Automatic annotation (TrEMBL), chain B:
Transmembrane segments: none annotated. Belongs to the CRISPR-associated Csm3 family. This is CRISPR system Cms endoribonuclease Csm3. Residues 11-225 form the CRISPR type III-associated protein domain. InterPro entries: CRISPR-assoc_RAMP_Csm3, CRISPR_Csm3_endoribonuclease, RAMP_III_fam. One of its GO terms (biological process) is defense response to virus.
TrEMBL record, chain D:
It comes from Thermococcus onnurineus (strain NA1). Belongs to the CRISPR-associated Csm2 family. It comes from the Archaea. Keywords: Antiviral defense, RNA-binding. This is CRISPR system Cms protein Csm2.
Amino acid sequence: MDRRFYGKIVIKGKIKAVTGLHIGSPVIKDPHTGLPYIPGSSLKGRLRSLFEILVNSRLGEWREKYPSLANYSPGSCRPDNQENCGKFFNRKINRGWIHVCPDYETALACPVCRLFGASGKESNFPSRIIVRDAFLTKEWEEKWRAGEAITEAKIEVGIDRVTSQANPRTNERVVAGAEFEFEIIYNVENTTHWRDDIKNLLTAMALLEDSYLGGSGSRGYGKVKFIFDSFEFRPLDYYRTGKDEDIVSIDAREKSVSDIFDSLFSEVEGKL
Amino acid sequence: RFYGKIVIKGKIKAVTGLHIGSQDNPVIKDPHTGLPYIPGSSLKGRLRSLFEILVNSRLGEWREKYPSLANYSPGSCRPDNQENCGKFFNRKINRGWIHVCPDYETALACPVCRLFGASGKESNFPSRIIVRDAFLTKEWEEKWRAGEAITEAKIEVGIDRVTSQANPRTNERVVAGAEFEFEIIYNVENTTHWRDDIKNLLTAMALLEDSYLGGSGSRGYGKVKFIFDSFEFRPLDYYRTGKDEDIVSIDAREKSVSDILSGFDSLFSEVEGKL
Amino acid sequence: PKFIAVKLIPKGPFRDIPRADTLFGAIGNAISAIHGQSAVEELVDAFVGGARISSAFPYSGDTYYLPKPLSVEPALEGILRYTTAKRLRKAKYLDLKNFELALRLRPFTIPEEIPYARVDVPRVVLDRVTQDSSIYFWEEIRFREKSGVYFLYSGPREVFDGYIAPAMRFLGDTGIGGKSTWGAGLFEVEFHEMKIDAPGSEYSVTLSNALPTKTPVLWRLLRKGGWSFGRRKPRMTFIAEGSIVKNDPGGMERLELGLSHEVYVYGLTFPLGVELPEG
Amino acid sequence: KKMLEKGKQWEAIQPYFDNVVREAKNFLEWSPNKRLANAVTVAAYLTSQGLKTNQVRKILDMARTTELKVKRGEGDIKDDLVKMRYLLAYTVGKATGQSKYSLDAFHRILDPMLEVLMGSPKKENFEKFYDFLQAVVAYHKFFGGG
RNA sequence: CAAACCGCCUCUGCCCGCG
RNA sequence: GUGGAAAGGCGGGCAGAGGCGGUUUG
Ligand SMILES: [Zn+2]
Ligand SMILES: [Zn+2]
């Protein structure tokens, strides 16, 4: 029922591996250029996985703003192996539990599922964000071309508690400071709730910026920072005329908690 | 009638990995050589879906240019399960709902079915573009004969939200950076409709620059990129006599946003002088 | 027997190896769009009085295949192995050199490779709101690298030069049958000459779908219909190719179908001489 | 011969171990099964000695760099081929121990396949040493050493 | 002018839906 | 005067949880 389209807010910028960055495969590398990269699967599934638990904590405090959160109650469906019952984490993937709403009209009011999309039997909601793969920037293509190391091999160990017998292994991780260039597209399918979706995406970006991305993470292998370049709007008439009619938010030197908001997005409000 | 055929040629650049699938998930490949390819239907229907959504946004604002969008209300016919009750996505093929017009003379004024084609009952407006099938550029067959990998195998995982349990699957994705070679042949059947049809086709292509093409697109598997070579008009007299009468516009280094405005007042000034 | 050979270098996959009935329909629809109504009737009169075309047969890199005559089945033992006799009866397309052998009832060889593949691709239909899918399968003829399809033309040269050669340049950019908006029936056309060494007898194999005016000698029956501007054509009993008539010129039939114009179905023969056994 | 690498296989698989190795004093010796057939017998009597395994991967990364330079990486694929000769004996020029005798069955096969590459094809003339470089490691893992 | 060791293991690795 | 016309193999899914480069040598 009723998919519309008004435009597409485009978020561009850089991902700064403030510490090392492990996304296993050996870090993944695209087969052509040979450099490492960040997928969009590894990033959408980690913005999601944080905003999940953010909703699960506030699961009762929102159900007058987001309906169909009334039909859940916190926890997993593992202590009673059923698909759709009163618990929030209501899909089995292979042996593990994940919140995906099972319908279109249920998931249109879920805050997680109107933004990261859903699936199901006899109904399906598709996403509103597109999270593209993040390759190395223009600087680091050439820092690779100038001969620098782009990855490292780190050597760790495991010590016996009684006799101090130690047992090494080798991880392989992107060097610190490496910088990848990303893009996130929110598809404005309704002009009532795009503020809420851009603000929930920024909540997920802030929670990722305090947590890690991939790899061990609890041992230091994460720590991504978001260096913003351009929010753009690209309205419905950019695509027909082709002319530069798109509204840009000026945030080249701001934080993901500094966007989050009424001062930045005022022309996007007025353009409706 | 018929007044010639405008042939649009160029290249597609899979800037991110391109995945289509062949029913641990393979991609579709030519059964004889083994190279991948982009189907013509997978490209055409993605263009049609994008332009359907764009039109459904604009059923109030184009009612004077295109009539027979006055017969439709913006929405879908899935809840009230009568076909063409009055919503836009009115025809049900098997389990999904598409906007396909039910007649000739209602689809001559609807901008989707005038270009992409309708089916109806006793009527059948056929399409007006031919989205020719897209194969790897000969540079990327030469890279295929240098032993280089032309597809990859990407392992993804699903993870329990409480206990962090890995649940992995693999997808076979085309190597990012690949090049395919497309062709789209528009049939000039009525000399009024041509400007609006090519503008709508380029609008549908430019929505595809910011969308994806098949497969897990929101997990980063689309990002297609059109790189035009040339247009040709191929007039009615060309198929009669077989000389070189066809106007060749040259836009070798132009994108689809640089093509809709920059060349449409200028690179089609020669074609409007021949109609 | 000097024939013009039209080669259809494929740009994609066909829907089927085109019959003569859907080659002539495609030529008529080309001529009505680049010339007019009154030049399709002159095409039809040229094929009534003179010229004939044949069905399309596969080629693969300068080897041209032709259908097997049915004249070799009743006396395949007198030619001659039970494995060879069975594989020599199953096979459909003989090579041009072998085909000229088998027209004279000589021992021949079948090709050990077919130039195409009938593959069925799964497609899907997605609704625009929920992206909720529905599969169907679609069959098509997917060709190899140098392989493709061709057909033969007899008759005069002003008919070829005014009608069939413009029709082939038109139909290269709107294909021969099938989902031609997926870029299926499309091709590049190029013309050669073929010469066929054929014995001058009373009996003729037909290289096009016959629709005869009298009973033939040995035949292989083929019902098919069509679709003419949306209207369903009734099913007609053609003879399939490679079948033996004697002195039977075939015949086109005009249909009714409720249109602005009559619709001809190409039921003419394409005779090559053949040597029979005693029955 | 899985039960070979027995204890006297060092005194059994050095029948003609270095003669044909010195006869392969260039890279493109023989494209056939003689590559694998030599590469099994090379590791067949290393295994009776020590052969500390994981001190090799710098050459693996260096061959990866030269292979990226095969894949349109750099036009000069000459300096990294010399940097292996710069690191040819520094390992036995760093520390010695119990597995040194297996290094005696490792250093004698270096200079037959290392002095070649100054006037060589950079993309070509390289895959056969690149195969012998991995099949010895592979069958040495398969006999049970790593 | 560094003596000696340890130089990866533990777990899942395509599903629900269209015919 | 084409066994045709219309039809996106696609929606959702973090390669992840755990592990001192360490033990002895005036
Ligand atoms: Zn939900
Ligand atoms: Zn329509």
